[PDB]
Each structure stands twice: as C-alpha cells, then as structure tokens.
C-alpha cells in the first residue's frame, strides 16, 4: 500500500472516546483479543497515527480482576480469562471486552476512587 498522511493531534474527549470505542467495535477489533503491555501500546499508536489521539488516555485500574477504563467514555475493559515481560503483574490472563454500560457508568471511579489523584 501507499504511505498515508499525518493526523492533527488532539486529546481524547468523552464524545471522542465514545466515537472511537464504537468505531473500533464495529470494525471487529479488540473484542476477545488477549491483552498485554505490548499490545496496549499498539492501540495508543493506532488511535494516534490513525485518529491523531494523544496517547495519554489509555489508563486502566491496576487489578486484579476486571480492569476498568480511567477515561470516561472509553467502552473497553480488561477481563480475566478462564512467561513474558509484557505479562500482567497480577499473573492474570487479560482480554479486551466491549461494555456499553461504561457510557453512563463510571465503574472505574466508583470502584477504585483511590487510583485517581
């Protein structure tokens, strides 16, 4: 393929987060895919190179268990299933999972408010 243009940088807003979530959702990306610290960055670069989103938005709750999005609007969480240095510290196998509820529920902050400063 041919080299594609740059995208004007911009911070991920709520609406922008909702839009990026569905867009990717409808594409068939992320869902069920195994998560790692490595593939986490891949996504940062994707929304940055493909949408111009500044990589300061993809922050989840430490864990263990379900890892909820720290940025309100992002509709993708990390859920346990059932070594590498990209592996989860909690020694848990994580996978991406779309949650529509996260559009009007701040699960992350209501469960682990201490992870916010």
């Amino acid at each position: 393929v041919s080299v594609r243009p740059k995208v004007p940088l911009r911070t991920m807003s709520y609406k922008l987060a909702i839009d990026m979530s569905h867009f990717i959702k409808e594409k068939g990306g992320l869902e069920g895919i195994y998560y790692s610290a490595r593939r986490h960055r891949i996504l940062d670069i994707y929304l940055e190179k493909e949408e111009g989103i500044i990589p300061d938005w993809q922050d989840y709750t430490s864990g263990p268990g379900i890892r909820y999005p720290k940025t309100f609007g992002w509709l993708w969480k990390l859920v346990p299933v059932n070594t590498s240095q990209w592996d989860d510290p909690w020694g848990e196998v994580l996978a991406w999972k779309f949650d529509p509820t996260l559009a009007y529920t701040y699960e992350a902050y209501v469960r682990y408010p201490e992870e916010f400063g």
Partner: peptide, 15 residues
C-alpha cells in the same frame, strides 16, 4: 517499511 510494519501490529488487534 515503516507504515507497513505498523499494519503487522494492528492485525494483532484485528484492526
């Protein structure tokens, strides 16, 4: 080769 290896990564996300 840059914007080509990027596609290799994207696929791991089914994107």
């Amino acid at each position: 080769a840059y914007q080509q290896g990027q596609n290799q990564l994207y696929n791991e996300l089914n994107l």
